[PDB]
């Protein structure tokens, strides 16, 4: 099990910056999207590295409906339901040629991933995250077994706020990772 860690995905990377004092009141004002998170279900972020959904068979839509693409369609009885809200969420700059970095503790291998990112005019701290504001940037083969898989993603014309939405097919079973990460597209190397 695991997630996307560069660029963070959403409740990662709440976990990763709160976890040590996920109670304070003052969340509210310096990170209101993690705050409602941490507030809705805790274990959204406690288990930050089971946002998966067995069974999907590739066709990725039909079990992930319009709106919650980042709580996986309600996988685990909505555990993940808040990471779907729609505010602004901490991004991690990147430039339009990057890497997705994923951990995976287990090394359970990837068959595929496939990597989509908002349309240019979307903007995710005011519209609910639907396909149709996605574009396929990057699409694997297969990953043999490891604890870190990096995917190298191209992009040309693309600024400000996005999210990416990464999707990791899992080789030891049907296994799908659905993990979106907020970026803000930019010139500037970090």
Known sequence: HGSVVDPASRNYGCWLRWGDDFQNPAMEQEDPMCWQAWQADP??????NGLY??????DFPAAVPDGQLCSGGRTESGRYDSL???????????TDDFTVKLYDQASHGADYFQVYVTRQGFDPAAEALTWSDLQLVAETGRYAP????????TTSGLSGRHVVYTIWQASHMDQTYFLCSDVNFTHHHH
């Open 43 to 48: 274990n959204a972020m406690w288990n930050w």
């Open 53 to 58: 959904r067995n069974g999907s068979g590739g």
């Open 84 to 94: 779907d809200s729609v505010g602004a969420w901490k991004t991690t700059d990147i």
């Open 146 to 153: 490891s604890q870190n898989y990096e995917i190298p993603v």
